[PDB]
């Protein structure tokens, strides 16, 4: 249950900062793209947000590996800890689903 249909970006930061640990993550509805999803991830005591693209033919992170479903995208990044990297090259790790 990393998938939280009910909450906003702000509420996701609050949840991760108070009930999560570094590595905690969840997925939630995107505000800036109605109908789409976003990952909210805690690292070093702060929260980063990562938009998930759904083109209708696959899901991806606006780049990188393509997936048929959102659960398979989440699974792949929980299994491949080095593959999710910033512009400046630091890794964002999806370690612990926040249920």
């Amino acid at each position: 249950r990393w998938f939280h249909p009910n909450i906003t970006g702000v509420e996701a930061e609050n949840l991760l900062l108070t009930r999560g640990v570094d590595g905690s993550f969840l997925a939630r509805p995107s505000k800036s793209n109605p109908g789409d999803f976003t990952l909210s991830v805690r690292r070093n005591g702060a929260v980063t947000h990562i938009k998930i693209q759904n083109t209708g033919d696959y899901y991806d992170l606006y780049g990188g590996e393509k997936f048929a479903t959102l659960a398979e995208l989440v699974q792949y990044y929980m299994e491949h800890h080095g593959q999710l990297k910033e512009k400046n090259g630091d890794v964002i790790e999806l370690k612990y689903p926040l249920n």
Binding site: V10, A46, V47, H49, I50, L61, G63, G64, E86
Partner: peptide, 7 residues
Amino acid sequence: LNYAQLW
């Protein structure tokens, strides 16, 4: 909210 820029 801080949105990461990837790659």
